[PDB]
C-alpha cells in the first residue's frame, strides 16, 4: 500500500549520510499514475552519488557498445587505452549475419591500445597510421568509426582532423565521435552524441542520390539492437503485413540501409531513449514522421501492428488483420500452456531506458505483475509513459543503487527478478529466480509473436526451477 | 512460426525458411554486400603467408588483444582482503565493466565501488568525489577497509590520491583511523597484472612501511604467500592444502577464494573470508615471502627485499612437476618442515598418469597464450609431457621474460619447433595458426573465435580450442579448477590427452570411410 | 609409402589413393558384397519404429549386452582387503579376461590368479587344482589372505569349495590357520554385482560367523561402509572424506582405492592398503552398517542384519542432492555426530551451481544405461537438474528395482517422459535413441558405437554420448573422478551442462551460416 | 650377462616354488643354444600351466572366437554361454576392417546367448535355434553364423552341430558351430586347431565344385594375418605392388566368399605360422598347394620376404619385386637414419603369444636394438626350434612365465624397453621401465612392411627415450 511504500523508502533512507539521503530522495517515488508531470514525483538522469555503487555506465558504452557497434560492416576503433574495448567485447547480443573479420566486424575487438607515449604526445599521428593499417588488412570495410575513450579529450586529441584529412585522402567514411566516459552521466549522453555523429557523418552522403526508388510501404526500424534476434522476429510481421523495411537502426545494420533510410515513409521507433534524437532530425530535415511502437507480448504487438497500418492504405489494414489471424492460435498455446504456470507472480524489473516498461505488456500477458520498475538513465519524458504503464502504489527507482536495490526485494518478496549481470549473482544466492533482461540469459528473441513463445517458456523455466526449493539445508 | 510444444529460440529458429528468405531479401535489397565471390577470396587471402607478413607489420593498429588494463588487477587484489571495498577513483564506467567481466568469469556477484568523475572533475578535479565517495561507500556497505585504484581519468587529470584521502580524514569525512590504502593504477600502462601488482604493493606499504623498527624477520615462524592475478578457485586451494599437509605456518596474502564461491543458502554475503589487516601488518615478522608468479610481481618484490628484508626465493611458477618440486623443496627448507609421504605420493601418481598417457602426447603441437607467468609454466610442463609448444603468445609480456622462456625451449628437444612472440595479438595468432597449423590452441574463451575461421577453411584445417586461462565465459564452472601444482598438473594432463582422443574419434566416426580406427580402447 | 617427418598411423595412412584403390579391388574382387544401395536401405531400416518393434520381440538373441558376469564383481571386492590375491577357481582364460578389462578401465596392475582348471579337471573335479594352487600361490605372491570366486566350469561340474580348501588345509598344502574366504559366483546368474555381493558375504561370514559370542553391537562407536561395486576412486575418497570431516568412526568394508592408485615411483606394489582383517572381525561391534549401492547387496544385508544384528537404515545410493543430504543425517543420527559448517557449506556451492546452469539444463533429453544404483541415482539427479531422463536402461535391473524407479518418476514432472528397461541391452537402446531421440547419453565406451550409428543416418540425428559410468576404455584417467555426493553432483553438473555448451558451440560454428548464435558468453 | 650367469638366475627364481611347481617351471626355461637341432632337448612347451602362479595364458575360445572367427567381418559370430567371455573380449583385438557395422559387417558386435540358470539346467539348443531365427530377421545381410562354445556348453551335452546342420538346411544359410570350450587344451593354441578344423569342415570346401573363378598364375592368399592396425593391408600393397593377386586374407578384414575362394589360389602366404598352420597343410594335402612362411616386420626380413616369394614365380614377377625393393629403399632408408641412433644397443625383452616373439626381432636389428630375452604364452616346439636359430647365443627363454618369473627376470637383466601385453604394461611402468604393447601396438600400427617400419621405429623411440623415464625419483629421495 501506498504508505507502506514511502515507509520503505524513509527507512532504507536512513543509512546514508545527509547529502546522499537528500539526493536519493528525489530518485524514489511511489507511483501515481494520474499526475500528468513525471518530473513532479521522481527526478532523473542526474549525476550519480559517488561511492554508492551505481549500476550505470558510460557514455562509450553508449555510443560504442549500443548504438554504433551493432553497426556490422564498418569497422569501430576503440580509441584509447585497452581497457574500454576488451570488456566491451561480444558482450551484447546484437546479432547480425555476415563472414567476421572479412566482410563484418561486430565481434572484433580493434584499438589503438594507447600506452604512456601516446597520452603524453598525442595519438593523433597513431590514429593516421592505425587506419591505413585497417584499410590494407581488412579491405572489405565499408567505413570506420572511432569511438573516443577517456583520455582522447584530456589530453587535448583533434581525431575531427584526422577524420577529415584521412577520409579525404582515401575517399573513405571516417566518423569521429566523441563518446569519451567522463561526459554526461550514463549511457545516455551516448546515444545522443552517437546519434549527432551519424546526423553529421553519414546521413546525409545520398541527400543528392535518386537512384533509389522509394515505395509508399517503405519503413525503417529504429532502436531496435536486435538482441538475440529480436529485429528478426520484428521485421518479419512487418513485412507479411505488406510493409518493406528499409532498415534497422542498428542491428543487424549495414552503412548502405543508414544511408537509405532518408527514403523511407514513416519511422518505427521502439527504443525512444536511444533513437528519438535522430528520428526527430529526419522528421524535421527530410519530413519523415516516426511513432513508437512495443513489440513485447502478443497485445502490444497487436495494438502496434493495428497503429502502424492505420497510417497506410486498406490493403496492409487488410494484411494486418491476416497476420494477427495467422498467429492468434500460436500466441493463445502460448498463452493456455504457461499463464496457469505464472498467475499472480509478481516481478521486480530494473534495466536501461526502455525496457522497463516496455515489458510490462509481456508479463501482464501471462498474468504475472509488475510491482516495482526502473531504470539506469532514463529522462523525464520515459518516467511520463513508464508511470501511465505501472499500477497505483508501485515503487519506482531511479539509478537505484546496489544497496537500495536489495533493501527492496527483500522487503517486498518478488517472485522474480529481471536485471542485469552485475544483479543476477546476487539475487540467486537469496533464493530469488532471476532472469537477465538485458542478454536475455542467452535465450530469445523475445519480440513479436515467435519472441513471447520464448519469454514465456524462459520465465517459467526459470520461476519455477526445482533448484530454488533446495537452498535451505534439511538440518537448519 | 512455433510450436509450442518445441519452442526454438534464436538457432534454430531463424534457420526456418520464411526467416531465411526474409534474410536474403534484406540483403539483396538494402545491405549493398559484397559478392560471396569476393568474400571467399577476401577470407582465403587472409589465411595466406602474405597476409600474415602484411599482419606482422602493424605498428598502431591492435586487433583481438589478449590483455586487459590496470584497475581490473587491482579489484581483483583487493578482493582478497577481509571486509574491503575495492574503490575505484575516476569514472564509473569502468566499474561496471570490471564488475561485468569478473561475473561472467566466476558466476559470482563482484562488489565493486566507483565515485563518479564526471567533466566537472575532468575541469576542476576529483576532489570532492573522493571525500563524498568515501563517506557515502563506508556509511552505505560498511567496509573495514577501503582500496582506492584509479580510471585512466583520473590519472590524466593528475588528482593527487593522498592528498584528497589526507583530506578526507582533516575534514571528517571518514575517520583518521579509518585504513584507505591506495594505488596508482593507468590502464595506459602494462596491462591488468601490473594493476594486481601496484595494489597489493599499495596495501603492504600502508600497514608496514611506517612500522618497521618493531619487526623480526622470522619472528613469526611463517611464510608469506603472494598468489598474483589469480582467477582459478582451485588454485588458492592447492597452495594451502600442500602447505597444511606439510605442516608448515602460511599467510596468504591476497585470499579471494571465500568471497568468490559462497553458497546459496538464502543470504547475501557482501564480504568473505580474506587477509585480515592482522597478517599485513604481522607480514614482515615471516621468515620469508613465496610470490607464486613473480614475472608480474616485480613492484611487490623490490618492496619486500627492500623494506622487510626477505631473502625472497626464485622460484618459478608452481607448474609441471619440475617447478612444484623445486616449489616444495625451498618450503621445506625455508620452514624446516620435511615433505610428507602423501605429497610423495601425489607426485608419484602424477608421473604414473605421465607414463600412461604419454604415446597419445607426444609430438602435439600446441598454439597458446595468457599472462607470462602462466604461459612459462604451460610451456614448461607441455615440455615435461613431450608436446611441442609451437606459437607461444604473451600480449603482455616483456623482453626479458622472453629470453628465459626461449631458454627454457633451448633445453629440451620438444622445444626445437617454438616462437615465443611478445607484443602480439589473437589476429596475430590466427595467422600463425593458419600459415603454420598445430593440433590445437590452449587459451581463454577469445580463441573460439579463432576456431571458427580454420574450421572456415576447411575441416582439415580446425584448430581446437581447449579453453585453460581467463577469461572463460562460454563454459560453465571451469574456474573452479587447478593448473597449480601437482593437482593441477594431473587435471592439465587430463584435459590434454582427452581432448586429444575426443579430436580423434570425431576424425574416425565415419562409418565405412573412417571408423576403422574408431577403437573401443585407447 | 610414408614421409619420414610426418609418418602415418592407420588413421590416416588408409586414405592415401594408393591404399584407398587397393581396397576397392580387394572388395570387387573378392569380397562378394552386398551393393551399397542395399546396405544403405537396410541401414535406413534398422532405424524404423517397424525394426524396433520387431527388435523388442527378442527372446533368445542378447546384441551389445551392459553387463558381465558374477567373478568380475567377485575380483574387485576382494582386491580391496589386505595382501589379499583375488583367486577364481576354474578355467584360466576367465582370469586373462578379468585382468585385461579392470587393466584397460584403471590403467593399473590387476593382479588375480587361476589355479587353471582344464579337461582333466572336466572330468575328475578341480580338487587337485586347489591344492596345489593354494600352495603355489601362496609361496609365490606371498598373500596374507586368498579370496577365492568361482568360473562357470567349475558350477557346472559342482565342486564342493568348502571340502576341497578343507582337505587343502587337512594335507598340509597351507596352514589351518591361513585364511580362505570363498563364495560360488555363476556367471548364469545375476551379473558382476552379485558376484560382489557373494563375495563380500562370504569374507563377511569366514570371519565373523563363528565368533559371534564376543561381540556387542555399537561397542567400537564406528560405522561400517560397504561400498559395493564401485569403479570410481574418488567415490571411495569423498565417502572417506566426508566421514572424518565430521569426525565420524567409520570403517570401510573392502577399500581397494590404494592397489588400484599406486605411484610410479620405481618399485611395483602388488599389494597396498585395504581393509584389514581385524576391521571384519571387529565389524559386528559397529553402531550400524551403511550400504552404499543397497540394490546389488541384498545378499550381504541379509547377513548382516540377520547374524551381525544391525538396524541396516534404508538409504538411497548417496547421488545427488537429496539423497546426499540423507546420508549425512543419517550418519549423523547413528553416529551423534553434527553435520559440520564445512559440509554445509559444500552443500550450498552446489546448489549456487544448479541455480547458475538451470537455464541450459532445463528440459535436456537423456538417455542412460548402467548397474541399479548408479542408474538410479543419475536419474534423481537429473530430475533434480530439471532434465528429463527420457531412456532408462538397466541390463542387470529387476522388477522390483523398477517400481522404485518409476515412483521416483511419478514424483516429479520431469519424469512424464521417462521409461525404465530392465534386461534390455544396447542393441534395443541404439532403437530408442532413433526412434524417440534425445540429446544425449550417458552411458559407458560401448555407446560411442550407437553415437556413430546414429551420426550415419545425419548430423542432425547424431546423439553424442557422455562418459559416465563402467566401463570407460576410450579416454584417459576418468576412474579418478566423483560420481557420489556433493562432489560427484558437482562434477556430474559441470559435465552435462559442458556437453551442452560444447554441442551448441559445434551448431554454431558455421561462419555465415549458424554463427550469429555463437556467443562469448553463456 | 654370460651363459651361467643366466642359468644360475634360472635357479635363484625357482627357489620359491614349491617342490611340484620348481620341477615343472624348470623345464619351461632355457638359456638359448642356437646350436640344438631339437628345441625339446632344451625347453618343453604346449603343457598345462600350473595351478596358482599367475599365467598370462587366454582360452581355446580366446583363440577360436577372439582370434580366428572373431575377425570374418560379414559373419555373426555368438558367444554362446553366459555373459563374460563375449564382452571381455568385445573390440578387445584391433583386427581393423572395411564395412558397415551393424549392416553388412559384424566385428565389433556382441552376439551371444546370455545364458541365464534355466538354460544350464535344462539345455541351451532350443534357445540357440530361436537366437538363429532372430539373427537372420534383425541381421538380413549376414552371409554366415558361427556359434562359438564357452565352457558350460560340452559340460552340459548341448548338440550344437545338430542345431547347426537341422537349422542350416531349413534355411539355406552356413552355420558354423564350434567346440572352443575354453576348458578344452590348455591355452589359447588349440583354439586356433578347433577353429582351423571349423572352417574345414563347414566352409572351406563349398566352392569345391564351381569352376567359375577366374585363376591367375599369380593368386596368392595371406594365411595368418589379423590385420592389427591394418598390418595385413600394408603387407598386401607390396605383394600387390610386386604383381600378385591376394585372393584373400584370413583373416583380418576377411569375408567369407574370399575363404571360400582360397582353395582356387597358386601358393598360400603363411605369416603366423601358430594359429594358422593346420589349415595350410590341408590345403596343400587336399587341393595341391604349397605353402610358405615369411616375414614382414623390418626391411630386412621383408625384402628377403619379397624375393623368396617372387622366386616361386616368373621372371616378371622377380622383376617388379626388384622395382618394388628399390621404390621403399629410400624410405625404410630415412627411417633408420633418424631412429637408429636414438636406439642403438638398446636391449628388449618381449613375452607375446605364439609369433611375435621371434618375429619381430629382425626389425629391432634393423633399428641397432637386441633382444636380450623372449618367450611365449603358447608355442609348441616347432615355434622353438625357429626361435633358437633368430636369438642370440646365452638369451634367456621363458615358456609360459609365470608373473613372478618375469618380473624378477626384469628385475636382474634391466632391459631399457619391454615388449608384451595389457596385463604386463603397467607393472613395468611403475619400475621405470619403457613398455610396449606388443599385441595391440598400444593402439598405434601398423607395424607390418614397410610404411609399418616407419610406424614402429617411431614408437619405439617415442616411448623409450620419452622424456618422463627421468621422473620417478622424487628429488629429495
Ligand atoms: S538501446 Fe538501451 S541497458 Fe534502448 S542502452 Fe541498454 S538493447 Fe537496455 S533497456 Mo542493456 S535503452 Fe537497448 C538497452 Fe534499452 S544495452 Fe540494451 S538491454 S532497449
Ligand atoms: S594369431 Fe596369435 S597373442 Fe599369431 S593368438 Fe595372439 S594377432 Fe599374439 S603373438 Mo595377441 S600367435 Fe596373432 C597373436 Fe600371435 S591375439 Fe595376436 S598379438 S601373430
Ligand atoms: S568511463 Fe567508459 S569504460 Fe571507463 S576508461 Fe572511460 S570510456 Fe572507458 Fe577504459 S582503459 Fe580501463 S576501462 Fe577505464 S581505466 Fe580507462
Same mark, same amino acid.
Given at each position: 500500500?501506498?504508505?507502506?511504500?514511502?515507509?520503505?523508502?524513509?527507512?532504507?533512507?536512513?543509512?546514508?549520510?545527509?547529502?546522499?539521503?537528500?539526493?536519493?530522495?528525489?530518485?524514489?517515488?511511489?507511483?501515481?499514475?494520474?499526475?500528468?508531470?513525471?518530473?513532479?514525483?521522481?527526478?532523473?538522469?542526474?549525476?550519480?552519488?559517488?561511492?554508492?555503487?551505481?549500476?550505470?555506465?558510460?557514455?562509450?558504452?553508449?555510443?560504442?557498445?549500443?548504438?554504433?557497434?551493432?553497426?556490422?560492416?564498418?569497422?569501430?576503433?576503440?580509441?584509447?587505452?585497452?581497457?574500454?574495448?576488451?570488456?566491451?567485447?561480444?558482450?551484447?547480443?546484437?546479432?547480425?549475419?555476415?563472414?567476421?573479420?572479412?566482410?563484418?566486424?561486430?565481434?572484433?575487438?580493434?584499438?589503438?591500445?594507447?600506452?604512456?607515449?601516446?597520452?603524453?604526445?598525442?595519438?593523433?599521428?597513431?590514429?593516421?597510421?592505425?587506419?591505413?593499417?585497417?584499410?590494407?588488412?581488412?579491405?572489405?570495410?565499408?567505413?570506420?568509426?572511432?569511438?573516443?575513450?577517456?583520455?582522447?579529450?584530456?589530453?587535448?586529441?583533434?581525431?575531427?582532423?584526422?577524420?577529415?584529412?584521412?577520409?579525404?585522402?582515401?575517399?573513405?567514411?571516417?566518423?569521429?565521435?566523441?563518446?569519451?566516459?567522463?561526459?554526461?552521466?550514463?549511457?545516455?549522453?551516448?546515444?545522443?552524441?552517437?546519434?549527432?555523429?551519424?546526423?553529421?557523418?553519414?546521413?546525409?552522403?545520398?541527400?543528392?542520390?535518386?537512384?533509389?526508388?522509394?515505395?509508399?510501404?517503405?519503413?525503417?526500424?529504429?532502436?531496435?539492437?536486435? &538482441? =538475440? #534476434?529480436?529485429?528478426?522476429?520484428?521485421? $518479419?510481421?512487418?513485412? /507479411?503485413?505488406?510493409?518493406?523495411? %528499409?532498415?534497422?537502426?542498428?542491428?543487424?545494420?549495414?552503412?548502405?540501409?543508414?544511408?537509405?533510410?532518408?527514403?523511407?515513409?514513416?519511422?518505427?521507433?521502439?527504443?525512444?531513449?536511444?533513437?528519438?534524437?535522430?528520428?526527430?532530425?529526419?522528421?524535421?530535415?527530410?519530413?519523415?514522421?516516426?511513432?513508437?511502437?512495443?513489440?513485447?507480448?502478443?497485445?502490444?504487438?497487436?495494438?502496434?501492428?493495428?497503429?502502424?497500418?492505420?497510417?497506410?492504405?486498406?490493403?496492409?489494414?487488410?494484411?494486418?488483420?491476416?497476420?494477427?489471424?495467422?498467429?492468434?492460435?500460436?500466441?493463445?498455446?502460448?498463452?493456455?500452456?504457461?499463464?496457469?504456470?505464472?498467475?499472480?507472480?509478481?516481478?521486480?524489473?530494473? &534495466? =536501461? #531506458?526502455?525496457?522497463?516498461?516496455?515489458? $510490462?505488456?509481456?508479463? /501482464?500477458?501471462?498474468?504475472?505483475? %509488475?510491482?516495482?520498475?526502473?531504470?539506469?538513465?532514463?529522462?523525464?519524458?520515459?518516467?511520463?509513459?513508464?508511470?501511465?504503464?505501472?499500477?497505483?502504489?508501485?515503487?519506482?527507482?531511479?539509478?537505484?543503487?546496489?544497496?537500495?536495490?536489495?533493501?527492496?526485494?527483500?522487503?517486498?518478496?518478488?517472485?522474480?527478478?529481471?536485471?542485469?549481470?552485475?544483479?543476477?549473482?546476487?539475487?540467486?544466492?537469496?533464493?530469488?529466480?532471476?532472469?537477465?533482461?538485458?542478454?536475455?540469459?542467452?535465450?530469445?528473441?523475445?519480440?513479436?509473436?515467435?519472441?513471447?513463445?520464448?519469454?514465456?517458456?524462459?520465465?517459467?523455466?526459470?520461476?519455477?526451477?526445482?533448484?530454488?526449493?533446495?537452498?535451505?539445508?534439511?538440518?537448519? | 512460426?512455433?510450436?509450442?510444444?518445441?519452442?526454438?529460440?534464436?538457432?534454430?529458429?531463424?534457420?526456418?525458411?520464411?526467416?531465411?528468405?526474409?534474410?536474403?531479401?534484406?540483403?539483396?535489397?538494402?545491405?549493398?554486400?559484397?559478392?560471396?565471390?569476393?568474400?571467399?577470396?577476401?577470407?582465403?587471402?587472409?589465411?595466406?603467408?602474405?597476409?600474415?607478413?602484411?599482419?606482422?607489420?602493424?605498428?598502431?593498429?591492435?586487433?583481438?588483444?589478449?590483455?586487459?588494463?590496470?584497475?581490473?588487477?587491482?579489484?581483483?587484489?583487493?578482493?582478497?582482503?577481509?571486509?574491503?571495498?575495492?574503490?575505484?577513483?575516476?569514472?564509473?564506467?569502468?566499474?561496471?565493466?570490471?564488475?561485468?567481466?569478473?561475473?561472467?568469469?566466476?558466476?559470482?556477484?563482484?562488489?565493486?565501488?566507483?565515485?563518479?568523475?564526471?567533466?566537472?572533475?575532468?575541469?576542476?578535479?576529483?576532489?570532492?568525489?573522493?571525500?563524498?565517495?568515501?563517506?557515502?561507500?563506508?556509511?552505505?556497505?560498511?567496509?573495514?577497509?577501503?582500496?582506492?585504484?584509479?580510471?585512466?581519468?583520473?590519472?590524466?587529470?593528475?588528482?593527487?590520491?593522498?592528498?584528497?584521502?589526507?583530506?578526507?580524514?582533516?575534514?571528517?569525512?571518514?575517520?583518521?583511523?579509518?585504513?584507505?590504502?591506495?594505488?596508482?593504477?593507468?590502464?595506459?600502462?602494462?596491462?591488468?597484472?601490473?594493476?594486481?601488482?601496484?595494489?597489493?604493493?599499495?596495501?603492504?606499504?600502508?600497514?608496514?612501511?611506517?612500522?618497521?623498527?618493531?619487526?623480526?624477520?622470522?619472528?613469526?615462524?611463517?611464510?608469506?604467500?603472494?598468489?598474483?592475478?589469480?582467477?582459478?578457485?582451485?588454485?588458492?586451494?592447492?597452495?594451502?592444502?600442500?602447505?597444511?599437509?606439510?605442516?608448515?605456518?602460511?599467510?596468504?596474502?591476497?585470499?579471494?577464494?571465500?568471497?568468490?564461491?559462497?553458497?546459496?543458502?538464502?543470504?547475501?554475503?557482501?564480504?568473505?573470508?580474506?587477509?585480515?589487516?592482522?597478517?599485513?601488518?604481522?607480514?614482515?615478522?615471516?621468515?620469508?615471502?613465496?610470490?607464486?608468479?613473480?614475472?608480474?610481481?616485480?613492484?611487490?618484490?623490490?618492496?619486500?627485499?627492500?623494506?622487510?628484508?626477505?631473502?625472497?626465493?626464485?622460484?618459478?611458477?608452481?607448474?609441471?612437476?619440475?617447478?612444484?618440486?623445486?616449489?616444495?623443496?625451498?618450503?621445506?627448507?625455508?620452514?624446516?618442515?620435511?615433505?610428507?609421504?602423501?605429497?610423495?605420493?601425489?607426485?608419484?601418481?602424477?608421473?604414473?598418469?605421465?607414463?600412461?598417457?604419454?604415446?597419445?602426447?607426444?609430438?602435439?603441437?600446441?598454439?597458446?597464450?595468457?599472462?607470462?607467468?602462466?604461459?612459462?609454466?604451460?610451456?614448461?610442463?607441455?615440455?615435461?609431457?613431450?608436446?611441442?609448444?609451437?606459437?607461444?603468445?604473451?600480449?603482455?609480456?616483456?623482453?626479458?621474460?622472453?629470453?628465459?622462456?626461449?631458454?627454457?625451449?633451448?633445453?629440451?628437444?620438444?622445444?626445437?619447433?617454438?616462437?615465443?612472440?611478445?607484443?602480439?595479438?589473437?589476429?596475430?595468432?590466427?595467422?600463425?595458426?593458419?600459415?603454420?597449423?598445430?593440433?590445437?590452441?590452449?587459451?581463454?574463451?577469445?580463441?573460439?573465435?579463432?576456431?571458427?575461421?580454420?574450421?572456415?577453411?576447411?575441416?582439415?584445417?580446425?584448430?581446437?580450442?581447449?579453453?585453460?586461462?581467463?577469461?572463460?565465459?562460454?563454459?560453465?564452472?571451469?574456474?573452479?579448477?587447478?593448473?597449480?601444482?601437482?593437482?593441477?598438473?594431473?587435471?592439465?594432463?587430463?584435459?590434454?590427452?582427452?581432448?586429444?582422443?575426443?579430436?580423434?574419434?570425431?576424425?574416425?566416426?565415419?562409418?565405412?570411410?573412417?571408423?576403422?580406427?574408431?577403437?573401443?580402447?585407447?
Amino acid at each position: 500500500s501506498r504508505e507502506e511504500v514511502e515507509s520503505l523508502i524513509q527507512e532504507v533512507l536512513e543509512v546514508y549520510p545527509e547529502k546522499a539521503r537528500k539526493d536519493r530522495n528525489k530518485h524514489l517515488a511511489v507511483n501515481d499514475p494520474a499526475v500528468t508531470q513525471s518530473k513532479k514525483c521522481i527526478i532523473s538522469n542526474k549525476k550519480s552519488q559517488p561511492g554508492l555503487m551505481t549500476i550505470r555506465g558510460c557514455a562509450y558504452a553508449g555510443s560504442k557498445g549500443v548504438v554504433w557497434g551493432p553497426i556490422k560492416d564498418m569497422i569501430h576503433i576503440s580509441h584509447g587505452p585497452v581497457g574500454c574495448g576488451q570488456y566491451s567485447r561480444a558482450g551484447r547480443r546484437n546479432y547480425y549475419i555476415g563472414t567476421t573479420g572479412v566482410n563484418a566486424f561486430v565481434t572484433m575487438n580493434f584499438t589503438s591500445d594507447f600506452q604512456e607515449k601516446d597520452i603524453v604526445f598525442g595519438g593523433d599521428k597513431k590514429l593516421a597510421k592505425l587506419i591505413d593499417e585497417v584499410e590494407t588488412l581488412f579491405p572489405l570495410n565499408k567505413g570506420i568509426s572511432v569511438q573516443s575513450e577517456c583520455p582522447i579529450g584530456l589530453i587535448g586529441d583533434d581525431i575531427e582532423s584526422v577524420s577529415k584529412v584521412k577520409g579525404a585522402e582515401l575517399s573513405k567514411t571516417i566518423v569521429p565521435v566523441r563518446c569519451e566516459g567522463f561526459r554526461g552521466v550514463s549511457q545516455s549522453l551516448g546515444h545522443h552524441i552517437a546519434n549527432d555523429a551519424v546526423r553529421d557523418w553519414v546521413l546525409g552522403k545520398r541527400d543528392e542520390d535518386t537512384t533509389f526508388a522509394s515505395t509508399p510501404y517503405d519503413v525503417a526500424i529504429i532502436g531496435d539492437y536486435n &538482441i =538475440g #534476434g529480436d529485429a528478426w522476429s520484428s521485421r $518479419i510481421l512487418l513485412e /507479411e503485413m505488406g510493409l518493406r523495411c %528499409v532498415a534497422q537502426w542498428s542491428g543487424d545494420g549495414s552503412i548502405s540501409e543508414i544511408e537509405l533510410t532518408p527514403k523511407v515513409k514513416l519511422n518505427l521507433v521502439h527504443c525512444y531513449r536511444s533513437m528519438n534524437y535522430i528520428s526527430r532530425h529526419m522528421e524535421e530535415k527530410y519530413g519523415i514522421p516516426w511513432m513508437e511502437y512495443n513489440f513485447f507480448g502478443p497485445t502490444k504487438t497487436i495494438e502496434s501492428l493495428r497503429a502502424i497500418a492505420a497510417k497506410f492504405d486498406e490493403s496492409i489494414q487488410k494484411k494486418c488483420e491476416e497476420v494477427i489471424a495467422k498467429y492468434k492460435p500460436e500466441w493463445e498455446a502460448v498463452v493456455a500452456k504457461y499463464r496457469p504456470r505464472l498467475e499472480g507472480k509478481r516481478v521486480m524489473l530494473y &534495466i =536501461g #531506458g526502455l525496457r522497463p516498461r516496455h515489458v $510490462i505488456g509481456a508479463y /501482464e500477458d501471462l498474468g504475472m505483475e %509488475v510491482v516495482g520498475t526502473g531504470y539506469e538513465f532514463a529522462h523525464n519524458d520515459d518516467y511520463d509513459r513508464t508511470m501511465k504503464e505501472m499500477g497505483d502504489s508501485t515503487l519506482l527507482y531511479d539509478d537505484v543503487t546496489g544497496y537500495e536495490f536489495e533493501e527492496f526485494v527483500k522487503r517486498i518478496k518478488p517472485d522474480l527478478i529481471g536485471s542485469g549481470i552485475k544483479e543476477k549473482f546476487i539475487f540467486q544466492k537469496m533464493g530469488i529466480p532471476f532472469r537477465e533482461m538485458h542478454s536475455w540469459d542467452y535465450s530469445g528473441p523475445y519480440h513479436g509473436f515467435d519472441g513471447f513463445a520464448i519469454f514465456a517458456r524462459d520465465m517459467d523455466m526459470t520461476l519455477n526451477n526445482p533448484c530454488w526449493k533446495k537452498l535451505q539445508a534439511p538440518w537448519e | 512460426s512455433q510450436q509450442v510444444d518445441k519452442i526454438k529460440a534464436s538457432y534454430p529458429l531463424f534457420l526456418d525458411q520464411d526467416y531465411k528468405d526474409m534474410l536474403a531479401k534484406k540483403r539483396d535489397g538494402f545491405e549493398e554486400k559484397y559478392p560471396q565471390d569476393k568474400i571467399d577470396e577476401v577470407f582465403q587471402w587472409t589465411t595466406t603467408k602474405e597476409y600474415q607478413e602484411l599482419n606482422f607489420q602493424r605498428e598502431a593498429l591492435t586487433v583481438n588483444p589478449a590483455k586487459a588494463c590496470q584497475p581490473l588487477g587491482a579489484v581483483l587484489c583487493a578482493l582478497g582482503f577481509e571486509k574491503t571495498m575495492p574503490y575505484v577513483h575516476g569514472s564509473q564506467g569502468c566499474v561496471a565493466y570490471f564488475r561485468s567481466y569478473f561475473n561472467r568469469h566466476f558466476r559470482e556477484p563482484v562488489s565493486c565501488v566507483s565515485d563518479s568523475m564526471t567533466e566537472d572533475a575532468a575541469v576542476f578535479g576529483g576532489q570532492q568525489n573522493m571525500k563524498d565517495g568515501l563517506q557515502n561507500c563506508k556509511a552505505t556497505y560498511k567496509p573495514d577497509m577501503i582500496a582506492v585504484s584509479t580510471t585512466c581519468m583520473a590519472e590524466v587529470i593528475g588528482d593527487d590520491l593522498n592528498a584528497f584521502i589526507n583530506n578526507s580524514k582533516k575534514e571528517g569525512f571518514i575517520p583518521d583511523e579509518f585504513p584507505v590504502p591506495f594505488a596508482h593504477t593507468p590502464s595506459f600502462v602494462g596491462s591488468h597484472v601490473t594493476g594486481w601488482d601496484n595494489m597489493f604493493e599499495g596495501i603492504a606499504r600502508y600497514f608496514t612501511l611506517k612500522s618497521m623498527d618493531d619487526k623480526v624477520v622470522g619472528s613469526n615462524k611463517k611464510i608469506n604467500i603472494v598468489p598474483g592475478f589469480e582467477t582459478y578457485l582451485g588454485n588458492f586451494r592447492v597452495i594451502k592444502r600442500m602447505l597444511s599437509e606439510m605442516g608448515v605456518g602460511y599467510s596468504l596474502l591476497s585470499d579471494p577464494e571465500e568471497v568468490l564461491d559462497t553458497p546459496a543458502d538464502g543470504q547475501f554475503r557482501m564480504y568473505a573470508g580474506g587477509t585480515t589487516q592482522e597478517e599485513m601488518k604481522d607480514a614482515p615478522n615471516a621468515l620469508n615471502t613465496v610470490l607464486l608468479q613473480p614475472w608480474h610481481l616485480e613492484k611487490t618484490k623490490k618492496f619486500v627485499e627492500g623494506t622487510w628484508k626477505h631473502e625472497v626465493p626464485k622460484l618459478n611458477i608452481p607448474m609441471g612437476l619440475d617447478w612444484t618440486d623445486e616449489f616444495l623443496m625451498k618450503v621445506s627448507e625455508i620452514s624446516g618442515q620435511p615433505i610428507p609421504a602423501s605429497l610423495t605420493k601425489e607426485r608419484g601418481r602424477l608421473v604414473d598418469m605421465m607414463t600412461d598417457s604419454h604415446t597419445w602426447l607426444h609430438g602435439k603441437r600446441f598454439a597458446l597464450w595468457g599472462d607470462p607467468d602462466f604461459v612459462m609454466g604451460l610451456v614448461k610442463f607441455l615440455l615435461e609431457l613431450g608436446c611441442e609448444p609451437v606459437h607461444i603468445l604473451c600480449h603482455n609480456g616483456n623482453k626479458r621474460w622472453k629470453k628465459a622462456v626461449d631458454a627454457i625451449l633451448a633445453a629440451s628437444p620438444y622445444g626445437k619447433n617454438a616462437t615465443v612472440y611478445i607484443g602480439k595479438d589473437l589476429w596475430h595468432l590466427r595467422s600463425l595458426v593458419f600459415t603454420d597449423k598445430p593440433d590445437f590452441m590452449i587459451g581463454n574463451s577469445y580463441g573460439k573465435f579463432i576456431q571458427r575461421d580454420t574450421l572456415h577453411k576447411g575441416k582439415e584445417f580446425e584448430v581446437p580450442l581447449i579453453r585453460i586461462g581467463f577469461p572463460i565465459f562460454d563454459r560453465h564452472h571451469l574456474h573452479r579448477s587447478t593448473t597449480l601444482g601437482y593437482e593441477g598438473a594431473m587435471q592439465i594432463l587430463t584435459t590434454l590427452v582427452n581432448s586429444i582422443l575426443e579430436r580423434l574419434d570425431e576424425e574416425t566416426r565415419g562409418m565405412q570411410a573412417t571408423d576403422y580406427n574408431h577403437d573401443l580402447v585407447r
